[PDB]
Amino acid sequence: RGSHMTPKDDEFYQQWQLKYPKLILREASSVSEELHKEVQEAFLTLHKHGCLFRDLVRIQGKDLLTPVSRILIGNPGCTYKYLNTRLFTVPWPVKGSNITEAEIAAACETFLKLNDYLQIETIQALEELAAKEKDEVDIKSRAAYNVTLLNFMDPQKMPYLKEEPYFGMGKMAVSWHHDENLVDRSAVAVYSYSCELEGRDPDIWHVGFKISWDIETPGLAIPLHQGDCYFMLDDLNATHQHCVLAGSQPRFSSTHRVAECSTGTLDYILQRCQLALQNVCDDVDNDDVSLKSFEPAVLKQGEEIHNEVEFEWLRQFWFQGNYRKCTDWWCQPMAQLEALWKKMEGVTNAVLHEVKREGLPVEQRNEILTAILASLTARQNLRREWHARCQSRIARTLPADQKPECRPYWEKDDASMPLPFDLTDIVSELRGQLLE
Ligand SMILES: O=C(O)/C=C/C(=O)NNC(=O)c1cccnc1
Ligand code: NI
Ligand code: NI
Numbered sequence: 001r002g003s004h005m006t007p008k009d010d011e012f013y014q015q016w017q018l019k020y021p022k023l024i025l026r027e028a029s030s031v032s033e034e035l036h037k038e039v040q041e042a043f044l045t046l047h048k049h050g051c052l053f054r055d056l057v058r059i060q061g062k063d064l065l066t067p068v069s070r071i072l073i074g075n076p077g078c079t080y081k082y083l084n085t086r087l088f089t090v091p092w093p094v095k096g097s098n099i100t101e102a103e104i105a106a107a108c109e110t111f112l113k114l115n116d117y118l119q120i121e122t123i124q125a126l127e128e129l130a131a132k133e134k135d136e137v138d139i140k141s142r143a144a145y146n147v148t149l150l151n152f153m154d155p156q157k158m159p160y161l162k163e164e165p166y167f168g169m170g171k172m173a174v175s176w177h178h179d180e181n182l183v184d185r186s187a188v189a190v191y192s193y194s195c196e197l198e199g200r201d202p203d204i205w206h207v208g209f210k211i212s213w214d215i216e217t218p219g220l221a222i223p224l225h226q227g228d229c230y231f232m233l234d235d236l237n238a239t240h241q242h243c244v245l246a247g248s249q250p251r252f253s254s255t256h257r258v259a260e261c262s263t264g265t266l267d268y269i270l271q272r273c274q275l276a277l278q279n280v281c282d283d284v285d286n287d288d289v290s291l292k293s294f295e296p297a298v299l300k301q302g303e304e305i306h307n308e309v310e311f312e313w314l315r316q317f318w319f320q321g322n323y324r325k326c327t328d329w330w331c332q333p334m335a336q337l338e339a340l341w342k343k344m345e346g347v348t349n350a351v352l353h354e355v356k357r358e359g360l361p362v363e364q365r366n367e368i369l370t371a372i373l374a375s376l377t378a379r380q381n382l383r384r385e386w387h388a389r390c391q392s393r394i395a396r397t398l399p400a401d402q403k404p405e406c407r408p409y410w411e412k413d414d415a416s417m418p419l420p421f422d423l424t425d426i427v428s429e430l431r432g433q434l435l436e
Pocket of ligand 2: 255
């Protein structure tokens, strides 16, 4: 039978060193009573203002409400994808930053100060680890945290908790996982805020650790008290799995990460829209969208971007409507991207019109199809999906506030849209032409 180790065990110190050295822990002592205070009320103020939400994720081909309440503070315009769910940052004061709520923006700025501290301490440790022992900028980058994700769980009004399967560690707030979508070998710093035998103490919160693939090696259970911080360094998050073992009391955690956001920033997706729209004759913003090229490469590029802004951004955003609760930082940008998206509906319709046009040689028409077909296919599947997901039984479980908006959405009676929401008629017709 699988077993686990805690500080009570003799072998614990030895196991931590030879099979888990890139895991670091810094107890509350290592953090000022000054910093402890504001962070926990930055925590609390954020909480009774109702900023944290359970997410309606997807894992193992099934829609699931997350027991843990989440919110993503971080750089302006940054996103972080979490189980096919793009979380958008509630923004933190950054140099040359602007503006939303007074009480709430206070907390944000805090978790930033928090972020700064953790950053320093991660560099020390990554220095010490390299000095433990034989570039200096790879270290600085792997600690360059751009977001934190906040987590809450009251175990006592959410008393529906799984048993840990491999080492009898007890109840799990969060089952064994690798944190996704981070920069390679980049660190993770967690601040743990708990409010107030034969193995691990069940009333006290623990982070657990196992080696991937490996339920034979005794796992590690790390007791976290009020204000304890741990640190996953370098390749730890890749080689090891971790889980959260629930206590009895509530608990918060600020988990600072370096998200790979090379395609997950506002500037990134805006620039993408601009590249799509280079193929548009852009004298005037009207409904007579006309294109500069019909070269196959340019057309697929446009329609792939069409898809990117629609499903990675718009549908992801409005699935989780009801952000405007924390800060209206994304309100304008989402409007801007909806407009950009709409214009590309025009582009699509424009291309469709062109494919049916009289004086066009089939070989040039057959070439155009093959360029846009998969992208229009892929648009059909994910449209069906996005709002299957957006009206399922556990989507109608609604508090009035929390409804999963399916946006954008329109139907036939809508002559403000150049195209139908369902493209099966079109994708059919286009495919029959290609097998003629
Ligand atoms: O609260 C803590 O100490 C750590 C919680 C934790 O391990 N969070 N990580 C994730 O929720 C997660 C899951 C799947 C992908 N990326 C991140
Ligand atoms: Ni987390
Ligand atoms: Ni994690």
